[PDB]
Ligand binder design. Structure first.
Ligand SMILES: NS(=O)(=O)c1ccc(N2CCCC2=O)c([N+](=O)[O-])c1
Ligand SMILES: [Hg+2]
Ligand SMILES: [Zn+2]
Length: 258
């Protein structure tokens, strides 16, 4: 049938409906810290979320997205390897069924517990659907999550997961401040990639932050109680909604540090 992360519709079957899966700039990738080139021409990352306006949280059957009001230059990301401004449209996670897997990007073949992706689109393109049609249309900020101490700013996300347990369910989720999810350092690795879930459009400029954020075992656990299925259908827990690392091919991962 249609895509997912199960044995019969998982990552290894996506190339049949979306031939771009075997593309030239696919994400995620394994970041080799010793092969990544330090580039001093890379400017600092500029995250301006002080005027962020969260609107809703939704379970789309592949994960839960927290959507923001992107009708104005409220929550933007600029600087880094980017040219111009990018509006935060939404953020989501990708976790595992166990604490030793869940991240999509790996650092030195190392996988973390999960991975937050704050999706952004280039404003010089008007809307989101026009950005996915250009090679520099999106900038996803990747933040790894490791199990350890709780993350206060992530708790308001965790408590509303009961009301979006199944596919297609939503809930009013305003006043969330994404700044409470950012690690202390903004060091990062950037590289040209794509979406990690279908359509798998090669339109992303990936900015994977070097520093991870810790979340309690209790916080990641409550992610695993969500379901892929819609209401009234046989329960399938939402776990391992991550794509395996892809070939780097004709690409170079740059770093803003040494
Ligand atoms: N996992 S990622 O961040 O690569 C990612 C995965 C999927 C999507 N899309 C595309 C259509 C709806 C949606 O959620 C995006 N995206 O916003 O482009 C991002
Ligand atoms: Hg594109
Ligand atoms: Zn993602």
């Amino acid at each position: 049938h249609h895509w997912g992360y199960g044995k019969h519709n998982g990552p290894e079957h996506w190339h049949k409906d979306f031939p771009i899966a075997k593309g030239e700039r696919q994400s995620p990738v394994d970041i080799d810290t010793h092969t990544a080139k330090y580039d001093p021409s890379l400017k600092p990352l500029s995250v301006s979320y002080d005027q962020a306006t969260s609107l809703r949280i939704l379970n789309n059957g592949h994960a839960f997205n927290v959507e923001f009001d992107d009708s104005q230059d409220k929550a933007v990301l600029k600087g880094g390897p980017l040219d111009g401004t990018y509006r935060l449209i939404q953020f989501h996670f990708h976790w595992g069924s166990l604490d030793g897997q869940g991240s999509e990007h790996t650092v030195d073949k190392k996988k973390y517990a999960a991975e937050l992706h704050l999706v952004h689109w280039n404003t010089k393109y008007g809307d989101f659907g026009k950005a996915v049609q250009q090679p520099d249309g999106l900038a996803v900020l990747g933040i790894f999550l490791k199990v350890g101490s709780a993350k206060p700013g992530l708790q308001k996300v965790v408590d509303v997961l009961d009301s979006i347990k199944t596919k297609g369910k939503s809930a009013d989720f305003t006043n969330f401040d994404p700044r409470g999810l950012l690690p202390e350092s903004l060091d990062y690795w950037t590289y040209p990639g794509s979406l990690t879930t279908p359509p798998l459009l090669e339109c992303v400029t990936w900015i994977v932050l070097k520093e991870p954020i810790s979340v309690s075992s209790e916080q990641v656990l409550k992610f695993r109680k969500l379901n892929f299925n819609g209401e009234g259908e046989p329960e399938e827990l939402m776990v391992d909604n991550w794509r395996p690392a892809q070939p780097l091919k004709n690409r170079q991962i740059k770093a803003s540090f040494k």
